[PDB]
């Protein structure tokens, strides 16, 4: 795969870290330059990193359930920061509790996320989607 840069982080007041280490490992192995801002990351940290590194995509991980709050407004802040059209992915355990997945997916797509991932998504699925979205399959 041709080299591209992503920002990777866990949003909000969320301290879950193991999935972040695995995602970094997997996307690096797939050929991406992973800019990993780590856990407990406000939206601004994702945007600062994407600007500094000219990132092609921002992968927001959210495990603790309060991402439904934390994730609102990221697209708008990205637009205002000059990142129009950047890919925004969100995945993990992104709402509080088991819910009807089509409802969750629409709720986050309506927030401006390009792709929205359910619990237990293998990193390989996001890698394949990213290659397709960046046209580097």
């Amino acid at each position: 795969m041709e080299k591209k840069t992503i920002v990777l982080g866990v949003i909000g007041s969320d301290c879950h870290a193991v999935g972040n280490k695995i995602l970094d490992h997997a996307f690096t192995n797939a050929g991406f330059n992973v800019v990993n801002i780590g856990v407990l990351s406000p939206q601004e940290n994702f945007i600062k990193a994407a600007i500094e590194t000219k990132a092609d995509a921002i992968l927001v991980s959210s495990l603790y359930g309060q991402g439904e709050i934390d994730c609102k407004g990221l697209r708008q802040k990205c637009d205002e920061a000059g990142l129009e059209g950047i890919l925004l992915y969100v995945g993990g355990n992104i709402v509080v509790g088991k819910q009807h997945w089509p409802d969750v997916e629409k709720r986050f797509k309506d927030m401006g996320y390009d792709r929205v991932y359910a619990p237990g998504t293998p990193p390989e699925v996001g890698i394949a989607d990213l290659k397709k979205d960046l046209n580097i399959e």
């Binding site: 909000g12 007041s13 780590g38 856990v39 309060q66 355990n93 509080v96 509790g97 619990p119 237990g120």
Partner: protein, 483 residues
Amino acid sequence: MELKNKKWTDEEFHKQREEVLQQWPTGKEVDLQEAVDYLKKIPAEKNFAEKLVLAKKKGITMAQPRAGVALLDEHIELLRYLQDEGGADFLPSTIDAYTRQNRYDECENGIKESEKAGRSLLNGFPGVNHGVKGCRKVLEAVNLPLQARHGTPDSRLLAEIIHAGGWTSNEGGGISYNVPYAKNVTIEKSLLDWQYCDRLVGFYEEQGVHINREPFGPLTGTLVPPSMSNAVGITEALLAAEQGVKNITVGYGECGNMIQDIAALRCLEEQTNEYLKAYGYNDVFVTTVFHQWMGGFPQDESKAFGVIVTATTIAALAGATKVIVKTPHEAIGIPTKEANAAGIKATKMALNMLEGQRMPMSKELETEMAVIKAETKCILDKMFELGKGDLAIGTVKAFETGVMDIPFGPSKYNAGKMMPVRDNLGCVRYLEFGNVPFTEEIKNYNRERLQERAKFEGRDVSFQMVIDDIFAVGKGRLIGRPE
């Protein structure tokens, strides 16, 4: 304040209290005089410390779930359901993650959004925002002892509110509620702030109010070697006892090999009592809590019961005083009250199917206990050496030098050098030792156990095995065997 493992004076503690209570307006509801009277009116059946004494005397394992939502009435209805339909022996109130980061402004917004949505947008109960009045309403609505369960580096105000609210146990400690739960908090600062929480319980005990404290054994819930987990728990018990705490539940998170897990819990209890008495704390009542599998769960609910109930069998045969209940929703999200009651019912059924049964002693168990005690002693010995006898200072320097090192901890004060992996029977071992201060004999034993897995699987032991072990249980088995 300077960090020293020494009981705070009454004056130093009072000075800190007056600062802490100003951190949110609900701090005004805390009146220590009035709270002591309120606490002493709680029936013994609803006092967490006294019920732990009862469990220990009767030789039974008590089951306790995790539970919490944004709104008060919904939270009470949830706990009543776990009590009545689930049959819980103890009740939690699990604190939301904004409270854990002291962001009570975000708690308040989450409360309002939860009211609008008709469902909890918070992942727990915002106890500081609900204040003493809200926390008392929870206690008065239930018939079981209540414990704050959370993960908060700076829990000082939370502790004031929940204890004045009649909750007679607080979980946590300066290591176990920092390293798994924070990225930027110094070990010195979390140890100082947990001295406050311990010293508050010390004040209550001095008035004759009995309140339990529970260090968070499982840490990151991800392949934590028993000797490192136990070193933390023993340390937090010793640091709590110095501030006056008298009723302590030390904890351990299941690794999955039954003999290793039973060895771990027995070593934890034995060495906790041994160290407390060696340092002059002769009136501490110690109990144990076994956490059902804290790693990734299988999403299939029948497989989830496989994990819940095998874990409960290990706890029962270990003689644990308490077992923390997982639910079939673990892989997906915060459990419904029904999924939680399902987990409690399966757990208590397993406990009652094993009434009075204990794992008898064996050569295998004796050998594993000797390994765990010797590894734990290496770590604690070095901590006391680094601290020149002061275990609190020794803990700070142990983290600075990688002597104490927690797998996958987000804290930037964690070295992140030690690497765990399972051996051929599934026991968690040390793959890379980093700066953990083991003797050559102790390192050799880990290596010999791990070589048996390399031989059986036909691959060298490696970080790829660690990844395999991180995913194994969610994929249906204990050991991450090659696909």
